Amino acid sequence: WTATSGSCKGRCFELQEVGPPDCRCDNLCKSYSSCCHDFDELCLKTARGWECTKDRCGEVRNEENACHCSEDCLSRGDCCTNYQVVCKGESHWVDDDCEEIKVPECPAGFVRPPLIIFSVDGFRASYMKKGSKVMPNIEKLRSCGTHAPYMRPVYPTKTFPNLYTLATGLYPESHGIVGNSMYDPVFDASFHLRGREKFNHRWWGGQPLWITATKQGVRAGTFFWSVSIPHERRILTILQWLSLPDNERPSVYAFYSEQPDFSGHKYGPFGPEMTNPLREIDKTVGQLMDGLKQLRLHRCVNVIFVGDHGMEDVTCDRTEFLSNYLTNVDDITLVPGTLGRIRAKSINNSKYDPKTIIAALTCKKPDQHFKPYMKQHLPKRLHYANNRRIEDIHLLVDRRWHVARKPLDVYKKCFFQGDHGFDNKVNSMQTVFVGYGPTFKYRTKVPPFENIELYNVMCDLLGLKPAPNNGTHGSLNHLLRTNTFRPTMPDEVSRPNYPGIMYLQSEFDLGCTCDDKVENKLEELNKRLHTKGSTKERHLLYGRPAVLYRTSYDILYHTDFESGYSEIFLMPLWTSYTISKQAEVSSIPEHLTNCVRPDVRVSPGFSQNCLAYKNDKQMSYGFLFPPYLSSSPEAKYDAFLVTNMVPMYPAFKRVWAYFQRVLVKKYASERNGVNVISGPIFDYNYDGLRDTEDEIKQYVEGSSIPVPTHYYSIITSCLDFTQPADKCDGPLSVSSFILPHRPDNDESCNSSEDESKWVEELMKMHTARVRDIEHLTGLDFYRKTSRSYSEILTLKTYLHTYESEI
Ligand SMILES: *[C@@H]1O[C@H](CO)[C@@H](O[C@@H]2O[C@H](CO)[C@@H](O[C@@H]3O[C@H](CO[C@H]4O[C@H](CO)[C@@H](O)[C@H](O[C@H]5O[C@H](CO)[C@@H](O)[C@H](O)[C@@H]5O[C@H]5O[C@H](CO)[C@@H](O)[C@H](O)[C@@H]5O)[C@@H]4O)[C@@H](O)[C@H](O[C@H]4O[C@H](CO)[C@@H](O)[C@H](O)[C@@H]4O[C@H]4O[C@H](CO)[C@@H](O)[C@H](O)[C@@H]4O)[C@@H]3O)[C@H](O)[C@H]2NC(C)=O)[C@H](O)[C@H]1NC(C)=O
Ligand SMILES: Cc1cc(OCc2n[nH]c(=O)n2C(C)C)c(C(C)(C)C)cc1C#N
Ligand SMILES: [Ca+2]
Ligand SMILES: [Ca+2]
Numbered sequence: 001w002t003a004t005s006g007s008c009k010g011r012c013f014e015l016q017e018v019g020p021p022d023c024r025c026d027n028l029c030k031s032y033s034s035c036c037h038d039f040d041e042l043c044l045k046t047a048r049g050w051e052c053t054k055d056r057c058g059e060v061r062n063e064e065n066a067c068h069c070s071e072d073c074l075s076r077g078d079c080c081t082n083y084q085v086v087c088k089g090e091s092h093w094v095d096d097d098c099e100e101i102k103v104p105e106c107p108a109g110f111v112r113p114p115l116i117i118f119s120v121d122g123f124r125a126s127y128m129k130k131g132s133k134v135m136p137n138i139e140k141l142r143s144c145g146t147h148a149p150y151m152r153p154v155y156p157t158k159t160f161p162n163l164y165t166l167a168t169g170l171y172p173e174s175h176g177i178v179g180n181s182m183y184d185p186v187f188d189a190s191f192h193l194r195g196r197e198k199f200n201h202r203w204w205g206g207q208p209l210w211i212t213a214t215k216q217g218v219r220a221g222t223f224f225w226s227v228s229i230p231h232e233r234r235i236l237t238i239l240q241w242l243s244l245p246d247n248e249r250p251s252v253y254a255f256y257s258e259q260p261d262f263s264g265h266k267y268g269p270f271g272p273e274m275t276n277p278l279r280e281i282d283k284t285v286g287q288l289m290d291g292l293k294q295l296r297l298h299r300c301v302n303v304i305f306v307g308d309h310g311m312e313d314v315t316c317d318r319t320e321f322l323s324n325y326l327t328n329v330d331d332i333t334l335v336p337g338t339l340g341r342i343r344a345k346s347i348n349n350s351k352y353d354p355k356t357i358i359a360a361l362t363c364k365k366p367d368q369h370f371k372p373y374m375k376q377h378l379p380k381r382l383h384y385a386n387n388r389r390i391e392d393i394h395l396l397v398d399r400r401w402h403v404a405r406k407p408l409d410v411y412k413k414c415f416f417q418g419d420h421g422f423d424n425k426v427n428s429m430q431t432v433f434v435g436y437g438p439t440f441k442y443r444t445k446v447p448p449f450e451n452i453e454l455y456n457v458m459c460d461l462l463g464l465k466p467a468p469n470n471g472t473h474g475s476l477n478h479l480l481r482t483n484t485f486r487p488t489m490p491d492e493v494s495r496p497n498y499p500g501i502m503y504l505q506s507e508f509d510l511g512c513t514c515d516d517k518v519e520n521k522l523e524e525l526n527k528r529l530h531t532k533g534s535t536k537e538r539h540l541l542y543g544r545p546a547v548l549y550r551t552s553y554d555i556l557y558h559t560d561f562e563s564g565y566s567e568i569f570l571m572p573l574w575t576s577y578t579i580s581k582q583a584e585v586s587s588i589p590e591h592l593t594n595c596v597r598p599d600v601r602v603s604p605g606f607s608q609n610c611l612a613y614k615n616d617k618q619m620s621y622g623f624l625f626p627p628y629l630s631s632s633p634e635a636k637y638d639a640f641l642v643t644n645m646v647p648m649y650p651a652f653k654r655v656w657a658y659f660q661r662v663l664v665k666k667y668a669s670e671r672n673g674v675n676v677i678s679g680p681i682f683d684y685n686y687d688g689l690r691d692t693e694d695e696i697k698q699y700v701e702g703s704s705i706p707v708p709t710h711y712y713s714i715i716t717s718c719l720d721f722t723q724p725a726d727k728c729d730g731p732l733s734v735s736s737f738i739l740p741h742r743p744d745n746d747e748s749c750n751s752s753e754d755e756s757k758w759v760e761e762l763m764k765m766h767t768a769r770v771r772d773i774e775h776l777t778g779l780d781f782y783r784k785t786s787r788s789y790s791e792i793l794t795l796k797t798y799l800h801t802y803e804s805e806i
C-alpha cells in the first residue's frame, strides 16, 4: 500500500529511495505503483517540447515548461540542451573539431571526472560502420576517443544478463541473472520480464557498480529508467544532477535506451526502418554532449557508449519444434527461443528421464538447427552451468533459428524479424564499445574484448576498488591514458621437485611392456644433457607455468618436451613442446604400438599402471606429447614414458590423435612454428574451477588414476609470423581449446566421417581463453616473456573465435 497523497514538490527524481510510509518520486515509483499524486505534473513536464527556439531566448521563466530558455536557466541547471546554440551563438558539440583531452578540464569542486554510461539495447557492432552516415555524434565519440571494432557480450546474449554483467563484472552463472526468464527451485519462484518478482533483491547477486561506489563514498545516479520516461527527460535529469552542489552530486550516471533493440525485433537488424532509430539515438547523444558542453563538462566527463548484445535475422518460420522429436512433449517445460532450457513439468514425475530426452534430441534430422547438451558439456567459454537456475538440459540454437515446444506456441501466444540470445561468439551478437574522455586514449583503436572486463575499468575510472569479479584486472589498461591498475603476477605456491634417476626398472610392476631393450659416449653424454634440461629453452618458451595451489609435483625434462608431473593426479598438469615450421610428422613404429615405459625418475607408487587400462573396458590411454612429432627415432622412446600417459576414452582418442598427428603440424606450418602446452582438466562440479582431489567422480577402474573431464591446449606463436615461434622478439599470438573428454562423439553429428570432416569443427566450438584454462588448472602461464604484464593479461583474455570479418 502507498499513501500517494504526499507531494513530489522539490523531490523530482530524488536519489534516495523513500520506501516505507511515503510516496516516491524516484524512477522506481512507476514500477512499484507508488508515485506521488503530482509526479507526472511536476516531474514529467513536456510543455513546449525539448528544444529552444529563437523566440524563446531570454523568455521569462515559466515553471510549466519541459525545459528552459530564460537567462536564469544555466545557474538553475535546467536549460534545453540546445540553449547556448540557439540563444548564445554557440556550436553543437558535434560540429567542433576534436581536440585531444590531455588532462581533465573540470569546474571547481569536481573531485574527479564523472563517468556516464550510455547504454543502448540491441546495438549490433556493425552499426558503427554501417550506420556511420546517420550517426555523426556517435561517429565523433568513436573516431576521437578509444573504440573497439566490437565488444563480446556474455551468453545468453539477452538484455538482463548482459546489463547486469556490465554492472558486476560477473558471468551470469555467478550474478544469478541467467536469462530474461528464470525458475529458481530453492525459492520455488519465477523471474519474468513483466511483473514485480524481478525487483526482489534475492535474484540479483554480486555487487553492482552503484553499490561498489556507494560503499566507498562515491554517489550514484539511477541505473534503471522507467520505460515511459522519454529519453529527452532522462538526459535532462542527468544534467540536472550534474548541477547539484558537490556534496550531493553523483559521480557515476547511466542512461539506457530501449532502441535500437525494440525496432530490430520488428524489422530485423538491417531493415530499412532501422535508419530512424539510429538517427534518434544519435540525436540523444548530441543532446547529452551539448548539455555537457553548456555545463563546461565536455572535457571533464568520461563517457562510455556501450551495447548489451547485437541482433540477428530470425523469423517464425525458422522454428524447430520439440513436438517433432519427443513423444512425451507434455511432460517437459521449455524456456524457448534463441536458446532452450528444459526441465520436468512435474517434480512428482519419476518416469522423467534426462537421458532419453537428450537422446531423442540428438542428430535426429539432417539439417537440425539446435544441439542438445547436458549443461556441464556446453563449451567452457560460455561459463553457463554453475547455477541452480540453469536447467540441466540446454539447447544451443543455430543463429537465425528458434526452438519452441510445439507449433501452437508460435502462432497462438508472423510478427518479428530479429532476435538475439545465441552463442556469444556469433558475429551478429557482437555489440559496441567506445570510451571518450580525459581518462581514455585519444583516436585509439583497441582489439575486441569481453564485457566482463568493463566493471574493473569503471571502478578504475572512479578510483574504486572492484569487488571480486571475472574480469582480469589490467587486461584493459591499454584503453586508458591514466588510472591504470598495475597488477603483480601471483606468487607461485608450490615449488617443483627436480628428480634424477632414482629407480631401477625391476622395481616397477605396472604390467606395461615395451620393445625398447635395443642398444657410446658421443650420444650418451648428449641424452644425459637432455634429461637435465639442455633443450628446455626450445620447448619452454615463456617460463614454466606457476602452480598456484599446494601440491606435490616434479619437473621432467626430455629432448622434445618438458612436463610438470603431479604425484597426486599421477599425470602431468602440463606438458610443453615446440614444433618448428620445418618439423616432420612420423608414425608410431610397429614394434612400439603398445609400448609404455617406466620412468626411472618417478616411483612405482606415483606412476600409472597398464593393468588398470587393460581391465577398464571403457578406458584407453593417450599421450600428452605426441609420439608422431618426435625429433628422432631415439627421442621417440621418451614419448612412451608412463609419465606422459593420460586416460582417454577411445572415442576421444579419435579427436586427440587427429589434433596431434595432423593439426599441430598444420598450425606450425601456418604460424611459422608453434609452442604447445597441453594437459588435463578436472571440473566435475562444473564451477569453472580446478577440482581438488576429493571432488573427482571417476577413476580408471580399480585404480587411483583420475579421469579428466577435459583436455586443453594452449598454442602460442609470434604475432609477426615472419619470425619463428622460438625466436620471437615482439608480441605473441595465441589460440587455445578446452575439449570435453567424452566417451562418445554424439556432439559431432558427422563423426562417422573421417576426422578431417568434423574434428577441427569440434575444436573451434571449444575454443577458450588462456585465462579459462588458468581457472580450471590453478596454473599461471607466460611468467617469463619480454612483454609487459598488462599486455600478457590481454593475451590471456584473448579468444580465437574463427568467425570471419565483422
Ligand atoms: C567469477 O568471479 C566470482 C567472484 O569472485 C567467483 O565466485 C566466487 O567463487 C567462490 C568459490 O566458488 C565463492 O566462495 C564461496 O563463498 C561462500 C559464501 O558465499 C556467500 O557470500 C558471498 C560474499 O558476499 C556472496 O557473493 C555469495 O553469493 C552467491 O550466492 C548467493 C545466494 O545463493 C547469490 O545471490 C549469488 O548470485 C552468488 O551465487 C553464486 O555463487 C554460489 C557459491 O558461492 C553458487 O552456489 C551459485 O551457483 C552462484 O554461482 C554467497 O551469498 C562460502 O560459504 C564458501 O566456502 C565453502 O568452501 C570453503 C573452501 O575454501 C570452506 O572454507 C568452507 O568449508 C565452505 O564450505 C562449506 O559449505 C560447503 C557448500 O555448501 C559444504 O560442502 C562444506 O561441507 C562446508 O559446510 C566459498 O568461499 C564465492 O561466493 C563466489 N562469489 C560470487 C559472487 O559468486 C567465480 O568463481 C568466478 N568464476 C570463474 C570461472 O573464475
Ligand atoms: C547501464 C545499465 C542499465 C541497467 O538498466 C537499464 C534499464 N532502464 N530501464 C529498463 O527497463 N532497463 C533494463 C532493460 C532493465 C542496468 C540494470 C542492472 C538495472 C538492469 C545496469 C546497467 C549497467 N551497468
Ligand atoms: Ca537487450
Ligand atoms: Ca571444479
Ligand code: NA
Binding pocket: 613, 614, 615, 616, 617, 618, 619, 620
Ligand atoms: Na581399456
Ligand code: NA
Binding pocket: 745, 746, 747, 748, 749, 750, 751, 752
Ligand atoms: Na557422432
Ligand SMILES: [Zn+2]
Binding pocket: 122, 159, 261, 262, 265, 420
Ligand atoms: Zn531484444
